[PDB]
Design a protein around this nucleic acid. Structure first.
Ligand SMILES: [Mg+2]
Ligand SMILES: [Mg+2]
Ligand SMILES: [Mg+2]
Ligand SMILES: [Mg+2]
Ligand SMILES: [Mg+2]
Ligand SMILES: [Mg+2]
Lengths: 240, 93
RNA sequence: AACGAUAAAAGAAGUGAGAAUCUUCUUCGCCGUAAGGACAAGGGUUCCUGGGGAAGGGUCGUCCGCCCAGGGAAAGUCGGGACCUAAGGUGAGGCCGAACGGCGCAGCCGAUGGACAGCAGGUCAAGAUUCCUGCACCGAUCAUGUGGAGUGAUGGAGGGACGCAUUACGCUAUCCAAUGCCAAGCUAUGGCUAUGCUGGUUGGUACGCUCAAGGGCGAUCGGGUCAGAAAAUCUACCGGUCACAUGCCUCAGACGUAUCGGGAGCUUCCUCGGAAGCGAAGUUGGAAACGCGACGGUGCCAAGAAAAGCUUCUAAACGUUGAAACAUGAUUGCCCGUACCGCAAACCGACACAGGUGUCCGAGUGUCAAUGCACUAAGGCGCGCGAGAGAACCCUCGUUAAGGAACUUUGCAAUCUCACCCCGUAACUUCGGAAGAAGGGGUCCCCACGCUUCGCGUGGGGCGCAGUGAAUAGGCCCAGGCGACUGUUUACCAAAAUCACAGCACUCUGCCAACACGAACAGUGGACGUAUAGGGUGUGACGCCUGCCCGGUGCCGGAA
RNA sequence: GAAACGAUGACUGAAUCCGCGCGGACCACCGCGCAAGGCUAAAUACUCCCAGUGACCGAUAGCGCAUAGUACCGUGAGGG
RNA sequence: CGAGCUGGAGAUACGCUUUGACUCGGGGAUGUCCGAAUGGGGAAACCCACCUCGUAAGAGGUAUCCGCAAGGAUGGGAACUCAGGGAACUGAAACAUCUCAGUACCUGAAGGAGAAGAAAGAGAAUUCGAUUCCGUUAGUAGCGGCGAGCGAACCCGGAU
C-alpha cells in the first residue's frame, strides 16, 4: 500500500446518468501505472514486490529503477519478486522487458502493446492477455490481438515481453449476488420486465419476446456498429 | 475620540450589585469590537481594564396595535478595572 | 356527539370576589434504556422577577408555554471564523454556443472530515471550561541574560493517511459486599438492643532511586548517474558497518507525601423559609466499557479521502560585531454563538395533534447472558373536564360444564407450545443440512459431602395443587404448486409465482471503442478502463438436458 | 404557381457609357433610376408621474387596497 | 412668509420663535451597511486583507471592459420602439396546407420616443419626386386544400 492518487466513484456526466447501472463501490484508490515506459528506457530495475490492486484484474509489479524512483508496472504472467526489468531497445527480450516491435522476434507473445508511440500501453493489459507478433512488414508489424484480429502497428512502439495473467477469471465465480455489489450496482434490468413507456421490450400482458432491440431503437444481435474511418485501412479481419 | 461609542450605563440590579465589586457594566454599540470599547472607556473615565466581556442582545415587544413589534438590538459590555477601584462616582449611584 | 391514549387518586391547610381544577404539606399510583439526563437541528425570548386576568388553554382557573413591564445571556484555550481540504460549487487567462448562455486547468468557496493552548470548584431569581476563587497552558510583541552562530522558502522529501471481522494483556469511569472507617440518633408493635437500622466512605494539581502492563524504535559511512524540474549537509535505490537477546525511549494507571476543592451532616438567625459559618472517615475484598493503554495481535478481501499544521532540506536572500534557540520578567489576546424548549404542549405535523426527529449518558436487585423481562434509585410524571350509575348494545380483557373444527370460503380468531439443563431425534440430501426435528425427563427449599468458583454434582430431608412457581417466553407433523437461495416492490386496498440474483447463452465494441448526455468538429460519462473489458438482450443455484422447420421478417455475407 | 424583385446559408462570380438595374417568366422596342459609405429634425407611439374634466363608481361599487400587496396560504415561483 | 411652531397620533414634560421660527420655493453640505456593487470571500445588509495619507481616532484606493489621455461601459425603468428566437389551443363543424401568428412568450439593444429616411423608387402621366402618420382608394387587384379564410398599392385628400 503506497504512493497512489485517490479515485472517486461517479457513473454519469454533467447532467444525468449516461452509462446505466454501476453505483456500488468500496472506496478503492488509483495507482499511477507506467505504460508508455520510455523516459526510463536505459535503466535496469528489480521486482520489489507484486501487490494486488483493483480497477484492473492484473497483478501489479512495484519496480525500482537505479534512479531511485519507483514506478508501478503491470505484472506479466511469470515474474517472481526480485527479478530484473530493463527498458530501452537494448534489452534481452525476456519477461518484463520492454522493447519495441521492430526488435521483437516473430512468434513472440507480448502484451502492454501501444498503438501510437507513447501515450502509454493500450492493447493487451487486462487479466491474462496475449498479443503475439505475426511478421514485420515495412514500418508496421502484423500482430494478433486477443480478439483474434490483425492490425498493422508501426514497430516504432515499445511492448512488454510476455502475457499478463493475474490468474484467471475462470474459477472466480463471484459466488452469489452482492459480490457484484462489492463492485457495480445491481446489474442489468430486464427491459422485458418494464413498461411500453420505459423501454421497447415493455408491456405485453404476461411474458413477451418480439423485435429484439436495445433500450433505444437499434438492435443488439449481429448489427454492426463500427463506422467508416482511418484505422479502417490500418486493420485486417474484423469479423471473428 | 473616546466619549463616543458607549451608549448608556447598564442599570439593572446585578450590574449595580456588581459595581460594589468594582465591576462596571454599560451598553456599548453592537459593532464595537471588544478593543475599541476597552479603549474608549479607559479614556472617558481615566482608568485601565484588567478584563472585558461583551455580548449582543435582541428586543421584539409591544403593548398592542396589530403592529407586533420589532427587535431593538443592544450590546451590553462588562469591564473590570485595575485594583484602583471605582469610576467617578457614577458608580455609587 | 365529543372534551384527544383506562399511568388512578385522597385528605388537610392556604390564597381569593369566586376554585375539583392555583400554592403548601402528607400519602397514593405511573415511567425508570425511560414518560430521567446532555446536545443537534429547528424555534425564539418561549428563560427569571413582579404584575395581569379579555381572548388562547377542548372544562374551572385566583394559574400557564398566554397579556404587560423590567431583568437575564460575559470565554486567548468550548464550536465556528481570521487555517486545511472532499463531493460539489466557482473559475483570470482557454474550449463551445441564435440570444440568454453551455463547459473549463490553476486558483478559490465549500464539513459532515483534518488541525489546534485549561482543569478543579463556587455561585445571581435567571449565565458559566465564558464571571469569582486556586493553580495551568498557547501565541504574539518588548526588555534582560545565556548564546555564541546563520536564518532557512508560494520548491523537494518525510509525515499527516485512515478498511472489515475477531482477539491477548494491564487499567480506569463506574458498580457491588463487609462485625472495615466516620456521623446522626432511635429504638417500643412479639423480638433486637447492636456484631441492629440510615447515611457518607475523594476530585485537581506538584514532587516522589515507588510500583507498573502495554506500547515505539535503526544510526551511520559511503556509491552511482540515469530519480525527486533545479539545488541539497534532505529523500529513494545500491552496498559496508552493529542492528540475537537486548537495549533503550514512553509510561495507561496505581501507590506515598503535600496541597487546593469537595465532603454526610452540625450550628445560628429568620421577615418562613432561605441566608450565613463550620466539617468527620475516606479500608479490605470483588466486578467492570462500546473508553484509556496503543497507529497492540491474528485473520480476511470486496483491497479501504485530500489538504494544511508539522519534521527535515535547499533556492533566493539580508546577515556571519549585534543570528536561530532557551529561560526570566512584562504587555497582549479580535469577530460570531453561548438564556429557554430540544423524542417535544416550545422543532415538522392547520390544533398545548396517541405520529415523525440525528447523537451521547442511561443506576440497583433478581433472571446463563443482555440496552430483554419484572420491581425500583436519582429524577420525572398522574397525560387541562368532573361526578354518579352499573341496563340494552360496542370495544379491550379473565374464567367456563360436556363435546372438541361439528364453525367456516379458510381452525379467520383465540388457545395449546413457550426459557435453560440432560437424554433422544425420520424421510430426503449438493452430506452443510433437514433439527429446537419428532418424543421424554429435570427446574423450589434445607443439610452434608466433594467439585474450578459465582455457581455445580452426589446423597438424605422438607413444603404446596403447582417449584423458568409471578413478567419476558417455538404449537408440531405428512404431502403437493410456484420460485432455487438472502434480498426487492405497488409512500395512502396487491410483498407475491413480481423484480433482482449467482450461473448460462447470443451479439456488438479496437479504443478519441461500441454506447449514452449535450445548442457544441465544447465538454463528459463509459474508463484514468482496453476484449478473460465494456455495451446490449434474453435466461436464471445445481442436475440430466434443450429436438424438428430458415418459406416469410430481421441480421450477416455474397453480389452478375 | 408561367412567378418577378427583394433577402441570404452554400457553391460560384460581371461590367463601367457607343456603362449598369429595374419596369413580374422571356425578347426587342419604349420608359423610370444610377446600387455595393454615412448622419438627419418634424408630424407617429405609449403612458410610472402631474393637472383638468366626466348623462364614471361611491364601499359585495370603484384599483387588490377609503390602503395592504399587509394578514393570511405556499419549500418556492406564486396567491392574496 | 409674517405667529406661530414643537410630524401622522390624537400625550406629558422640555422648549424653540422679528438679531422672524414654522412652512413653501431654490441651490449646498452630511449621507452607516447592502444592492450593477466593483478590495477578496459571501448562503444581501455580513466576515477577512492590503497599500497610501495620518494625532491616533479617522481619510482614501484597491472590479472587469474600450481607449496615450480625458473620458465612456456594466444596473434599473409601467407601457411604447427595433432586433435575434418564436408556440399551441383554436378555425377549417375531423385533419396533415393553410388558419390562430409571426400574436403569446424568451432574449438583446435604445430613447423619450423610436423606427424610417433623401431613389439602382413608385407609376403608365414620356407623372410624382426622402421617411413616417390619419383619410380614401377597397375589402377593389390578387392570394387560397382557389376550402376555411387572408388581403395590397398607385392616384386623391390631410398632419408635417
Ligand atoms: Mg365518568
Ligand atoms: Mg405435484
Ligand atoms: Mg421467492
Ligand atoms: Mg425474503
Ligand atoms: Mg353602507
Ligand atoms: Mg393603497
Amino acid at each position: 500500500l503506497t504512493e497512489a492518487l485517490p479515485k472517486t466513484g461517479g457513473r454519469n456526466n454533467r447532467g444525468r446518468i449516461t452509462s446505466r447501472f454501476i453505483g456500488g463501490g468500496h472506496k478503492r484508490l488509483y495507482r499511477i501505472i507506467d505504460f508508455k515506459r520510455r523516459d526510463k528506457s536505459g535503466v535496469n530495475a528489480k521486482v520489489a514486490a507484486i501487490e494486488y490492486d483493483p480497477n484492473r484484474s492484473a497483478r501489479i509489479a512495484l519496480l525500482h529503477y537505479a534512479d531511485g524512483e519507483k514506478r508501478y508496472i503491470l505484472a506479466p504472467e511469470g515474474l517472481t519478486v526480485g527479478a530484473t526489468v530493463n527498458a530501452g531497445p537494448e534489452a534481452e527480450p525476456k519477461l518484463g522487458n520492454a522493447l519495441p516491435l521492430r526488435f521483437v522476434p516473430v512468434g513472440a507473445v507480448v502484451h502492454a502493446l501501444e498503438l501510437v508511440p507513447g501515450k502509454g500501453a493500450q492493447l493487451a493489459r487486462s487479466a491474462g492477455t496475449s498479443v503475439q507478433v505475426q511478421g514485420k512488414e515495412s514500418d508496421y508489424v502484423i500482430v494478433r490481438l486477443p480478439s483474434g484480429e490483425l492490425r498493422r502497428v508501426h514497430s516504432e512502439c515499445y511492448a512488454t515481453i510476455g502475457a499478463v495473467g493475474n490468474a484467471e477469471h475462470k474459477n472466480i465465480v463471484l459466488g452469489k449476488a452482492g459480490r457484484s455489489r462489492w463492485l457495480g450496482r445491481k446489474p442489468h434490468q430486464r427491459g422485458s420486465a418494464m413498461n411500453p413507456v420505459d423501454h421497447p421490450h415493455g408491456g405485453g400482458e404476461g411474458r413477451t419476446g418480439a423485435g429484439r432491440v436495445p433500450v433505444t431503437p437499434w438492435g443488439k444481435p449481429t448489427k454492426g456498429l463500427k463506422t467508416r474511418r482511418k484505422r479502417k485501412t490500418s486493420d485486417r479481419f474484423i469479423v471473428t | 475620540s473616546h466619549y463616543d461609542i458607549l451608549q448608556a450605563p447598564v442599570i439593572s440590579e446585578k450590574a449595580y450589585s456588581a459595581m460594589e465589586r468594582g465591576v462596571y457594566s454599560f451598553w456599548v454599540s453592537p459593532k464595537a469590537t471588544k478593543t475599541e470599547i476597552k479603549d474608549a472607556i479607559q479614556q472617558a473615565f481615566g482608568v485601565r481594564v484588567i478584563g472585558i466581556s461583551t455580548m449582543n442582545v435582541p428586543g421584539k415587544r409591544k403593548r398592542v396595535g396589530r403592529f407586533i413589534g420589532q427587535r431593538n438590538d443592544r450590546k451590553k459590555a462588562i469591564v473590570r478595572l485595575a485594583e484602583g477601584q471605582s469610576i467617578e462616582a457614577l458608580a455609587g449611584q
